[PDB]
RNA sequence: GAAACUUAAAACCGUGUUGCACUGCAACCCGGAAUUCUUGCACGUCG
């Protein structure tokens, strides 16, 4: 991509979601949205009308 | 016997509280039942 050997740096960093104290954790709204894709694919990848 | 008013004049009047004492008062919960709840991946796309 310009050969021009460009070398990039760390300009921006996206942050993990943390507790009000400062420690990371995993929400329960994220895992339940995964289980609404496992059950909603097993009824559509196994068989369908 | 025929002829001459027991008549005249005179307030049933004057004074006087339907007045004195007396609580529309005592007792009584605007009280008993009721979830601001149900569904929702901070994620997708890279000459």
Tokens linked to A5: 């050997």
Say if residues A16 and A24 touch (Cβ distance below 8 Å): yes
Where helices occur in A1-49 by DSSP H, the ranges are: 28-45
Tell me the C-alpha distance between A28 and A34, whole Å.
10
Which residues neighbour strand B (beta carbon < 7 Å)? A 1, 27, 29-30, 32-34, 36-37
Tell me the C-alpha distance between A41 and A30, whole Å.
17
Say if residues A36 and A30 touch (Cβ distance below 8 Å): no
Q: Give the resolution to one decimal, in Å.
A: 3.1
b (16+ CB within 10 A) / e for A1-28:
eeeeeeeeeeeeeeeeeeeeeeeeeeee
**HSE, side-chain direction, 13 A CA sphere, residue A24:** 3
Task: List bases, strand B, within 7 Å of protein CB.
Answer: 40-43, 47
Tell me the C-alpha distance between A29 and A31, whole Å.
6
Q: Which nucleotide lies closest to A17 by the C1' atom and the CA atom? A: B42
User: Which residue(s) pair with A24 in the sheet?
Assistant: A18
A16: Cα separation from own chain's centroid: 11
């Amino acid at each position: 991509s310009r050969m021009t050997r460009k070398k990039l740096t760390l300009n921006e960093i996206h942050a993990f979601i943390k507790d009000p104290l400062g420690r990371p954790y995993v929400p329960g709204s994220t895992v339940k949205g995964m289980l609404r894709s496992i059950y909603l694919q097993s009824l559509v990848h196994k068989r369908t009308a």
